[PDB]
Amino acid sequence: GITARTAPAGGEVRHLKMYAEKLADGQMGYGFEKGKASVPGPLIEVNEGDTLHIEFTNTMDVRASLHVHGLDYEISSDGTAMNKSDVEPGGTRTYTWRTHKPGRRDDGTWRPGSAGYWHYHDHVVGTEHGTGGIRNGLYGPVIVRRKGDVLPDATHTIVFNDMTINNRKPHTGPDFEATVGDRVEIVMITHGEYYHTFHMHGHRWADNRTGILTGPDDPSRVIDNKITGPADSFGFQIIAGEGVGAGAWMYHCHVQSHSDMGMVGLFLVKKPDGTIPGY
Amino acid sequence: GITARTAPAGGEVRHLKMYAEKLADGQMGYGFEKGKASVPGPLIEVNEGDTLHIEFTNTMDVRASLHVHGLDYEISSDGTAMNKSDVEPGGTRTYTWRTHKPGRRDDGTWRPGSAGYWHYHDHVVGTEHGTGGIRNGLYGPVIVRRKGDVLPDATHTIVFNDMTINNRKPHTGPDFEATVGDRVEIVMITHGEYYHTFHMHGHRWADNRTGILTGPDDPSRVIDNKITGPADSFGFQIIAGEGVGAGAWMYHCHVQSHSDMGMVGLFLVKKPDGTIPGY
Amino acid sequence: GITARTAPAGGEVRHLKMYAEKLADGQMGYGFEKGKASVPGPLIEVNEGDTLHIEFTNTMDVRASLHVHGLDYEISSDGTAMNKSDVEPGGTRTYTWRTHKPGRRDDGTWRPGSAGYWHYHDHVVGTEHGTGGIRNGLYGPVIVRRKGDVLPDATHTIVFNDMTINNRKPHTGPDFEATVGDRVEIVMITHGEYYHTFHMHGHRWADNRTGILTGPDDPSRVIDNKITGPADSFGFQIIAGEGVGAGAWMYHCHVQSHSDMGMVGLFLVKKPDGTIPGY
Ligand SMILES: [Cu+2]
Ligand SMILES: [Cu+2]
Ligand SMILES: [Cu+2]
Ligand SMILES: [Cu+2]
Ligand SMILES: [Cu+2]
Ligand SMILES: [Cu+2]
Ligand SMILES: [Cu+2]
Ligand SMILES: [Cu+2]
Ligand SMILES: [Cu+2]
Ligand SMILES: [Cu+2]
Ligand SMILES: [Cu+2]
Ligand SMILES: [Cu+2]
Question: Do both C156 and C97 map to the same domain?
């Protein structure tokens, strides 16, 4: 676009602290600040070409780690036990993530860039595949922008983790709010044991990298329903209420017993007066 | 194409009656006419820009509704209990579905059009997610054509609903018939509890919006096998017997115990004399 | 590309022998030579336009067959019981597979070519859907190249067959080896009863036909995680260790209990001295 904000060229070196901690109720979560850990962990958004040094501190009583999808990392920052890149209790390690722009290789072929919707999670809590860590909440989203990507007003993360959304008790959302016309970005991630189908009432997106059609040539299927499995991640943007107006629009897993057993939430799209028709 | 028939520009306002009724054997189905209800319900095909007013009448003894994927609807035509848009027994409600062409937004971005393979189903029978209604047969296909889309000779709907095809008893098809050379469109929909993989012997299509490659630039994978989950919908066209000739070509779920337990049917492609080699 | 090797135009008629045999331990596998049967069966790679005549011999004590995805075959070479194209014990049959280039049809539309990542398997051992044959190991990969496709240094086949990789005992790989910079092709196939998610540490590919982006216009999502179901097949190429260096990079099903129960292997990327950092 040319009036929406778009991502700039990347290439910063960025530093950042993360903590893994046990939560009072038995869950585990990441944070940028000790005592401010969340499930999902905080969004990490960078631009293609950025380099990110994460001073990670495991504050728990068991070994834990930080593993990322899609981004360039050396085996040093694998986050696995095998490759000795996990972290002892109370320990601190610096993971490094790099990203790159697309371009021609010398053999004439086209190297894909790092741009996309990704995620990070533990790889050593409970099992050598982080099964316990993931079940407990050690997962969070990563976004890598390509230069020129359209930027949203807000970004929400929805994680189907086993039979929960964002580790919440059945039928407790989360719910999100927008005003009609808002540019809303969704990062959607699945974890655990089961397949799901993500569905949104009243909105749809493109089944490509960005969730947006480039222009009239993009043959990508347009959808409002997408099957997902453990560690899948995709994202998209929509205009809230576009062509459909305000309302309490559901989103849910469309697997019938999942939605029945509580994998449901609300996308509350409001008129400017903050009202929602019949809610 | 330029010799195949193609869809015209849309923009009609269309009216239409639908009924939901209980069938003699305990199933539930939609119809355009009372007493002519089917599972799957009738195809609804429109053009991008069309508006469709459906005079829906619930003739059953329990509340029922009509919910659609992909198409523009206001929350009034949500078809959910929450938003008060379901229908009392013997009641009548007018749902409205709109569709739109793609184009530029003012922010410079590209709005996707409504064009695609979609579906409709109940959202309130049995549970607040229509689990009972869907299991009983309250589902049907919707097609939205983009101006210039290639039109087929015939359109067949295949629905993997839990462990059945089109709610049929195991190993009872459906079977479809074509003559070699026919342009056959398939709308494929999944419902219920399970994932599946749809497979066709002897034919293949594009994994994009239409199931057809635009021309040589379309990088879409060409496939004869596709994993699907509850509420997924896609469609495609093939030339019957193209490059392979007449025959009784199977289609089935490729999940091994599903095909074994009966999720199988026949695509009977005939020579002009109506014969099928070795059948 | 223009320095990588690329596939030539097709159109050869090729002949070839295959055998199905029972293995000493109770499995079943295909081979190009009697006594040299493998699970997965040997790669069959051809060019668009090639024709392949396979002199198939069933050396087992039960009926068996050869069924292929994606490629053109007449119903004579269906490989099914129904269509009488399976093979009696000790019997010999000649299957024929053809392939075609894409191009314009007379109706003006675009016929897709045969190019892609496909597979072959039994259709009659154990059940009329080859459930027993597939479980026992009667499956192998097929690659059809389009003229101009980039050719790799090596091609590896990974098959998630029920809860095994390539029918191996849990936690026994397979492992693959490359040197940093190698062009590695992966053909990934799923069989049996379950869905999976294929994941690779440290590498990513395009979710299109080839696994490679054409250039900057290709909107295909770039991924390192892909959900798959029975009879799904896709493929891709990566540069070993590109942007990430040498190391013992894991690949696994990301379904948590699968990786835990053993669906894991190693992509061993080496420095030229053959060493792998921390292994
Ligand atoms: Cu891993
Ligand atoms: Cu679910
Ligand atoms: Cu819906
Ligand atoms: Cu992961
Ligand atoms: Cu719903
Ligand atoms: Cu199935
Ligand atoms: Cu097949
Ligand atoms: Cu639905
Ligand atoms: Cu079959
Ligand atoms: Cu698995
Ligand atoms: Cu990983
Ligand atoms: Cu098959």
Answer: no
